[PDB]
Design a protein around this ligand. Structure first.
Ligand SMILES: O=C(CO)[C@H](O)[C@H](O)COP(=O)(O)O
Ligand SMILES: O=C(CO)[C@H](O)[C@H](O)COP(=O)(O)O
Lengths: 195, 195
């Protein structure tokens, strides 16, 4: 009575909804909002930023990051050099611009030269094999997109409490999901489904 | 009747208050919260994240960034490789951790090896000469800290509207300052003072 079955969650994800994603069933886990990169709108980005740390990340497969010439920031969360999609952005940081950059990272027609680096989005490199190889939120995002038949790209950020800025643990995530009509899943659940 | 005189603003800054900082007097300017890096607490970081884009940046002088071995992210806003202060942080992204990292970047006793890279704070390299050479929010932050007799390090983020995630222009910044008891200045004002 807490977690949504995966096949129902995937349909929500396919229809451009966020999912609240926990590591497993533990009450002390902190929740992330995750949705498909190609489906994030200005309004949905505004929502994500409003209720999160605002350190908005875009999980991509290593292969896709390689195609887009987004190398690891250095040579643990696998940050690439940051970026903005050049055409149609100004400040880069706005909900509109962050959403556009995120959709562009998912778009299979995007080219390396279409992006300015550094920028205001944080792409992440998901390991090949995804959740079977690393049970990270990065791998979860790309896995969800893959299972949904979408481009292997997601967008994520950590839920934070309005009251005090503490990250939302399970109880608060359940409350947030109820208030905003967002389904909750956990990574263990996803691993079980694909295994 | 909008902008606080610089000497009064500096005293507020010295006492660990944020300032709302605009480029000049134009009503279309978007506002940033800026405060001294060494003075930011868990609670003040929570506040900054709550009302901003959450893409929290820490302006440092080039000399200080060089000392801390924080090279430009690539070889426009001058991002360095991101970082977390290692000791006393866990997730890096929490208000507590982001605040600690920010204070640590200001601390003249901090050493390069004290930080993990990449991380969850975005240090920025302010150009030598600060606002006399580049009228950026990066240079403004380091200038304010310098004028306040503090370490040449600040912390900044863009104010965003709760309603729709649009960046706060002047009118909304005035409202925000009144609601939260935060003074407003502009960069042109600061340039005039130092010139
Ligand atoms: O959720 C997170 C860590 O709690 C962050 O969103 C991170 O950017 C990606 O997570 P991971 O390192 O688990 O892939
Ligand atoms: O305020 C900003 C741009 O509007 C951002 O905070 C940026 O990180 C630093 O600004 P600048 O490039 O002006 O130094």
């Amino acid at each position: 009575n807490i977690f949504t079955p995966i096949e129902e969650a995937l349909e929500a994800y396919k229809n451009g909804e966020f999912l609240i994603v926990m590591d497993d069933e533990d009450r002390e886990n902190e929740g992330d909002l995750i949705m498909a990169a190609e489906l994030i709108t200005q309004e949905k980005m505004a929502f994500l930023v409003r209720y999160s740390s605002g350190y908005v990340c875009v999980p991509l497969s290593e292969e896709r990051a390689n195609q887009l010439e987004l190398p690891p920031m250095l040579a643990g969360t696998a940050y690439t050099i940051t970026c903005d999609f050049a055409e149609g952005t100004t400040t880069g940081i706005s909900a509109h611009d962050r959403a556009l950059t995120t959709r562009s990272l998912a778009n299979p027609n995007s080219k390396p030269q279409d992006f300015i680096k550094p920028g205001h989005i944080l792409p992440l490199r998901a390991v090949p094999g995804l959740l079977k190889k690393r049970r990270g939120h990065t791998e979860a995002a790309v896995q969800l997109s893959t299972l949904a038949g979408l481009q292997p790209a997601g967008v994520i950020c950590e839920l934070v409490r309005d009251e005090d800025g503490l990250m939302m643990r399970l109880d608060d995530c359940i409350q947030f999901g109820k208030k905003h009509g967002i389904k909750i899943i956990n990574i263990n659940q996803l691993v079980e489904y694909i295994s």
